[PDB]
Design a binder for these strands. Structure first.
Length: 601
DNA sequence: CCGACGACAGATAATTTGTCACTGTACAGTAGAATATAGATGCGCATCTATATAGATGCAAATTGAGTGGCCTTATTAAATGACTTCTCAACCAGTCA
């Protein structure tokens, strides 16, 4: 449901320079608090096993750095911004590492389980029919299915008769009469080996890096490498890998996770202003287009409404949720605080705009807070329960807000969206009780006046990829791509799909479980290419470049998110299902929506 | 002296020619014409022949499009572009101050 809106902040130099000095000084303990985990912390491998960072460890590394002679000059809210960012860095990276570990194991199982029909006969000492009969018994026992069969191979080895359980699993949890081609099986088993290899490589990841602004390592390395002689090829390359590294120009943003830690006001000139907790001397002026101003007026109205009411209304329902203050990169020459541009990005929960939507968040938080208090039931823990119960009481007192009746769709009408390489979207609206398609749309309809933009995107990707190649050979800085055009097209389709869902009173939009299509294609094309260029690895990589590149450029996750966002701002439910391997783009969309309807029970 | 033969002259019927009177006989519608044959020549109709085939067939290059087979450098770092995944996104109470 959340959105991010933005404004540039304007102030006189003294204020934009003082804030830069604090952020160039704050950017450094964001580096030192990474290193205090990256190599200093002894428990680190226990966290990599569990997949989660302990909720207090970054604060317990930061608390003694608050008096460090290098870091002591900063407000209490700038240290909380440091702790926030470093918590979110590790809390992300450990959660990436854990899903990779789980995938590697979850296929190391399957590379053991996957056997040819002849190997099952040898391993069982029995007929492939005896295996078909035992596979029929195992389905009769089971009737969670695929997991239950995996568990019944992980348990219940059963005098190697788990051979028949692998026979079900390789057949997609079904009986098969046909006996398989050993060349097709060799390609299949090789794809798993490739996925296993690729996972054992990706299992090791570069320990998350800090944004060093100082150039000190680079300058020290330059004067070392030019005046001294390396003792090894490894040392001479270690200096090369440092000297090639581009250094950052921007400090990490400030994060203000409490909405009240931004204070709003109106300037004499009638313009809006803002100030931050601990920087309450530095008034900043808001500059934003009238297409976004209504939120910045709402910020000040939410604040005035609470202050006019003796704090009896809660910022648990303030339209602003959190702010990220960032320096966007400028152009040309000048001091960093005169060259770059302070920009304030406000997280906003869009459903807090209206009274009917605010009531949803009131019920959502009142249920979550009630459960929290009953799960809790020590000294400061009682003070925390005072924060919570003052919220649980205050959240019932309403802000005066715009009214708009909630959208309601028919529980039987669904929009199916089918994504692919040639057709980025294609739509079928199904009445699932009639089994009747109400409408279909192809791309030429689904973004209408804008259909020239798909042809533009394909021209621009091809044109600009060649210009980047020509530019790199000359060391030109000019490096451009179609990324913002692809982002616009994915947003045009997201608006049109939801406008169509509203038009037909659909209860939900259905999006495919595409999963990691990029890795799957990379393994399939490799297992095939190894049969056509054996030993010539450069020829294996050249086999289907344009197909592999087009799959790595395929924006399916960004279109899926663009539709999710616009649907949840409108109130339409999102649902999911398996996308058919065969059929036209329409048939894919039709069967996808009907499948998601069948999954209701 | 007697008998036989030739010269010359003289007389004479046969022969030829002419004249004269009496008479048998053709004139009377009448033989070119009829009736066979061989032998050569010419016009007509049939009965072969020798030339003249164009259509059909067999075959043998002459490409012609469509296949198939054989031969190939690779591993790190850094930057750029295009993508994917994960994480995060409290709110009021307690201690100073003009």
């Amino acid at each position: 449901s959340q959105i991010t809106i933005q404004a540039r902040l304007i102030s006189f130099e003294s204020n934009r320079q003082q804030l830069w000095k604090l952020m160039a000084d704050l950017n450094t303990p964001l580096i030192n608090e990474l290193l205090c985990q990256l190599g200093q912390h002894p428990d680190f491998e226990k966290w990599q096993q569990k997949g989660k960072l302990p909720s207090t460890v970054v604060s317990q590394l930061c608390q003694p750095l608050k008096t460090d002679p290098r870091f002591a000059g900063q407000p209490s809210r700038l240290y909380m911004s440091a702790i926030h960012i470093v918590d979110y860095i590790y809390k992300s990276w450990l959660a990436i590492q854990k899903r990779l570990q789980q995938q590697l194991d979850g296929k190391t199982r399957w590379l053991e389980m996957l056997n040819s029909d002849a190997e099952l006969v040898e391993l069982s000492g029995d007929t492939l029919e005896a295996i078909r009969v035992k596979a029929a018994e195992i389905l009769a026992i089971a009737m969670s299915l695929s997991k239950t069969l995996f568990d019944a191979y992980q348990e219940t080895e059963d005098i190697k008769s788990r051979s028949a359980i692998s026979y079900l699993l390789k057949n997609g949890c079904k009986l098969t009469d046909k006996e398989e081609d050993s060349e097709k099986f060799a390609k299949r088993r090789r794809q798993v080996e490739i996925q296993i290899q690729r996972l054992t490589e990706k299992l090791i990841s570069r320990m998350p890096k800090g944004r060093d602004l100082t150039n000190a390592k680079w300058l020290e390395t330059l004067l070392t490498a030019t005046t001294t002689v390396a003792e090894d090829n490894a040392q001479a390359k270690r200096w090369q890998d440092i000297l090639l590294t581009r250094s950052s120009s921007l400090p990490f943003p400030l994060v203000f996770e409490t909405n009240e830690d931004m204070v709003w006001s109106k300037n004499q000139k009638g313009r809006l202003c803002v100030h931050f907790n601990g920087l309450s001397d530095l008034i900043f002026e808001v500059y934003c287009g009238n297409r976004q101003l209504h939120w910045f007026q709402r910020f000040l109205e939410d604040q005035q409404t609470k202050r006019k009411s003796k704090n009896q209304h809660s910022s648990g329902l303030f339209t602003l949720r959190n702010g990220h203050l960032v320096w966007l990169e400028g152009e040309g020459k000048g001091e960093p605080w005169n060259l770059h541009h302070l920009t304030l990005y406000c997280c906003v929960d869009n459903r807090l705009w209206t009274e009917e939507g605010t009531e949803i968040v009131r019920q959502e938080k009142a249920d979550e807070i009630t459960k929290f208090i009953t799960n809790m039931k020590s000294d400061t823990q009682q003070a925390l329960i005072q924060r919570k119960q003052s919220t649980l009481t205050r959240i019932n007192n309403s802000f005066e807000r715009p009214s708009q009746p909630l959208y309601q769709g028919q529980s039987h009408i669904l929009v199916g969206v089918s994504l692919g390489l040639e057709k980025p979207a294609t739509v079928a609206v199904v009445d699932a009780i009639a089994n009747k398609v109400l409408a279909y749309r192809s791309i030429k309809q689904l973004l209408g006046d804008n259909y020239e933009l798909l042809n533009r995107q394909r021209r621009q990707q091809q044109y600009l990829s060649h210009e980047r190649h020509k530019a790199q050979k000359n060391f030109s800085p000019n490096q451009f791509g179609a990324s913002e055009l692809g982002q616009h097209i994915d947003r045009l389709l997201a608006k049109a799909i939801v406008a169509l869902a509203r038009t037909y009173k659909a209860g939900s939009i259905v999006l495919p479980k595409l999963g990691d299509m990029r890795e799957v294609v990379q393994s399939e094309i490799q297992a095939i290419a190894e049969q056509k260029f054996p030993g010539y690895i450069e020829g294996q990589q050249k086999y289907a470049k344009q197909y592999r590149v087009n799959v790595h450029r395929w924006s399916y996750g960004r279109l899926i998110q663009s539709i999710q966002s616009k649907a949840a701002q409108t109130g339409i439910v999102i649902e999911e299902g398996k996308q058919p391997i065969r059929g036209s783009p329409h048939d894919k969309a039709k069967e996808l929506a009907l499948s998601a309807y069948n999954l209701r029970l």
